[PDB]
Amino acid sequence: HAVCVRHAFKQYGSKKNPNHVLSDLNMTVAKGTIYGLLGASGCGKTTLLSCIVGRRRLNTGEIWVLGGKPGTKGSGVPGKRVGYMPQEIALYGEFSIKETMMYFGWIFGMESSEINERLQFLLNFLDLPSQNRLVKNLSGGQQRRVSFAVALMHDPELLILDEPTVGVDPLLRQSIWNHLVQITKDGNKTVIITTHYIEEARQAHTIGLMRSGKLLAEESPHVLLSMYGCQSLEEVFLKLSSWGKIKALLQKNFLRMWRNVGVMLFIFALPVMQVILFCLAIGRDPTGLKLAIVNHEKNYTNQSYQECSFDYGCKFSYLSCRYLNNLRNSTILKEYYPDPESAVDAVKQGHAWGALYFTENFTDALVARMALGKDADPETLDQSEVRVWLDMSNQQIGIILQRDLQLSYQDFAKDLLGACEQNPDLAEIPISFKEPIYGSNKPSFTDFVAPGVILTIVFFLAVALTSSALIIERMEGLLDRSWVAGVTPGEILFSHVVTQFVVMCGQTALVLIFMILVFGVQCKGDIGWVIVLTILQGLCGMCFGFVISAICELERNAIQLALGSFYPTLLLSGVIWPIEGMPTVLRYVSTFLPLTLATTSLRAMLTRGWSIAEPAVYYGFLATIIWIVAFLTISMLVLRFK
């Protein structure tokens, strides 16, 4: 007996809306015959076929297919001994017909010599175009013909065809039925055809009519016609009551990316462009700021000329052009106005960032202030000071202008004394800053954000790749077709991890080369542990794509959940601002987030050179390991009940 289903029962949904898809179903399929299964809808037959192949399980009843229970190692129901043609075209695009044949033959263990003979025979028999034509370039009928040829290549002892000829040319239909008759006759082969056609399954040696989840009758066609006395079948029906699989899967995964230029540009040319733009735009010091200078010790000539001239040695000739000489040249441009009212007006518009206004007696009052110290009259204290009106609406620019205007006075003051043979240490505030313990006196903001950009690119470009791949592959029956072919779920998962591991290693090479070698972001720590931490974040990101793909069933719902969690964690992990800004209550919560302790750990490796032994460094390695385990437990728990 090819198949024996006895007292099959099946339920769907919850108790609120029970669905008795199968109820007390009996079925028998002998060896060497064709068994047509004609049903009204398209659900009971598909559910029965899924129970036969082993995908589903019966609530009550018994099944004996090919010798033993489906998928129990007592028989080879999922494997080379069965031939499956799904209702949908569960084929791979971007695959030539020859490549599809090779992939499935390797999955079935066929040698490459016989695959070519079978391919040539099937191409000659099924009226198909050249083997090199990609499947995505074919029409619906040719795609269905290729899907039918896939189920015939390994010569199984049980064929399960789901509407094999729905719109096939009538001559081709006749040839197909003749071939099925030839292979099934006087042999061990069996065919089980499921169709909505009532009038095509006349050549089936036994017909089973489905209704209300049970077989109304099951007899030979002409026997049914004679016994019920009807001219055609419709009148009778019109009654009022293991390394070869992994190698095959590895060459499929990499070839599914090479034929998508959009995918390669998104996961290999976007990080390179993102890193280039970040290192050129973020963190650098502003370097074009303009200042309106009103020097009343010199005559006004132009808005771009002042003839600031003085004597370098001594005698303190001007001291207003001498201060402006020490001003830093890279970030401040000098503009000249003849009136403090005319210079403040420029600031009130977008023509300057500040005003200076040296008074006409700046020199005399400044010398009389240093010489007569600790008892200077209020008149001197008012005529010897520079009056700066600043535009402090921008925080970072206001910081630079205040820093560069007070720092230039220190150099100016260290030049006045020292040119008259005095020590320059007399012009220093008692608060003296010694050599920094870490870093330097001129830090950069792009060194603070660089650790956060590296981890965010790797983490969230693996959530996108895994969720998209495992969802579009599951929705078109590609996973269910290869499961019947004999590919265990462990082998499906192993190949995805290896493929994703290699991809994330290429991204790590590109991101770290451009950040460090080209744009000169310092790495004072161990380069070996930076590579390990970046990769561990990629695996943690990949494990989050398992959660998303186990919850969401549509692409549009997965991207909302991926983007709905990428934004909040970016603003709480301290990538673009120090973690010390948040309140104490909000600082506790942010620590437990996936990327918070990993960004802190990477920032200490690069900016301070700390090793793995430091508590602040290995806390970012233990935090990723916990989240890898947590993301796997949640994903496994979701699949348990759903």
Ligand X SMILES: CC/C=C\C/C=C/C/C=C/C/C=C\C/C=C\CCCCOC[C@H](COP(=O)(O)OCCN)OC(=O)CCCCCCCCCCCCCCCCC
Ligand Y SMILES: CCCCCCCCCCCCCCCCCC(=O)N[C@@H](CO)[C@H](O)/C=C/CCCCCCCCCCCCCNc1ccc([N+](=O)[O-])c2nonc12
Scan residues 582-601 and list those touching ligand X (CB under 6 A): 594
Q: Which residues pair with 141 in a beta bridge?
A: none
Q: How far is CA 559 from CA 448, 466, 548, in A?
A: 29, 12, 9
Kindly list the distances between the CA atom of residue 106 and the CA atoms of 180, 191, 592, in Å, as whole numbers in the listed order: 25, 24, 46
Query: Can residue 553 be called a binding residue for ligand X (CB under 6 A)?
Result: yes
Q: What is the largest CA-CA distance in the chain?
A: 132
- Scanning residues 90 to 129, which ones bind a second copy (CB under 8 A)? none
Q: Is 354 annotated as a binding residue?
A: no
Question: How far, in Å, CA of 15 to CA of 597, rounded?
Answer: 46
Rule CB under 6 A: choose which of 378, 436, 520, 564 binds ligand X: 564
List the one residue from 560, 571, 576, 614 that touches ligand X (CB under 6 A).
560
Structure tokens given for 581: 């800004």
- Establish if 266 lies at the interface with ligand Y (CB under 6 A): yes
Q: Kindly state the tokens that stand for 447.
A: 């060194």
Q: Which stretch binds ligand Y (CB under 6 A): 146-154, 170-178, 502-510, 559-567?
A: 559-567
Q: Is 357 annotated as a binding residue?
A: no
Is there binding between residue 348 and a second copy (CB under 8 A)?
yes
Contact between 464 and ligand Y by CB under 6 A: the answer reads yes
| Residue 394 binds which entry of a second copy, ligand Y, ligand X, none, CB below 5-8 Å type-dependent | a second copy
Query: Nearest CA to 606 among 522, 514, 512, 509?
Result: 522
From the list 28-36, 174-182, 561-569, 578-586, the region that binds ligand Y by CB under 6 A is: 561-569
Choose the one of a second copy, ligand X, ligand Y, none that binds residue 50, judging by a C-beta under 5 to 8 angstroms depending on kind: none
Please report where in the chains the tokens 């069965």 appear, as a residue.
82
Contact 508, 596 (CB under 8 A): no
Which of ligand X, a second copy, ligand Y, none has residue 183 at its interface (CB below 5 to 8 Å by kind)? none
Can you tell me the distance from the alpha carbon of 189 to that of 615, in angstroms, rounded to the nearest whole number?
68
Binding to ligand Y in span 569-628, by CB under 6 A: 570, 575-576
| Distance in Å, CB of 479 to ligand Y, minimum | 15
Residue 340 tokens read as 């403090």
Q: Give the closest residue to 460 by CA, choosing from 206, 593, 267, 320.
A: 267
Smallest distance from ligand X to CB 75, Å = 33
Position 578 contacts a second copy (CB under 8 A)? yes
Of 344, 478, 531, 551, the residue at the interface with a second copy (CB under 8 A) is 344
Using alpha carbons, select from 11, 15, 1 the residue that is nearest to residue 56.
11
What is the token pair recorded at 200?
Answer: 């095509």
Amino acid occupying residue 273: M
**Interior CA angle at 350 toward 344 and 355, to 5°?**
30
- Does the footprint of a second copy cover residue 426 (CB under 8 A)? yes
Which of 453, 504, 515, 530 touches ligand Y by CB under 6 A? 453
42 is in an annotated binding site: yes
The residues that bridge with 28 in the sheet, in sequence order, are 4
Query: Cα(241)–Cα(523) distance, rounded to whole angstroms?
Result: 82
CA distances from 497 to 71, 243, 245 (A): 26, 16, 15
Return residues touching ligand X (CB under 6 A): 261-262, 265-266, 269-270, 273, 547, 551-554, 557, 560-561, 564-565, 569, 594, 634
Return residues touching ligand Y (CB under 6 A): 263, 266-267, 274, 278, 449, 453, 456-457, 460-461, 463-465, 468-469, 556, 559-560, 562-563, 566-567, 570, 575-576
Residue positions forming the annotated binding site: 12, 41-42, 45-47, 133, 141, 162, 196
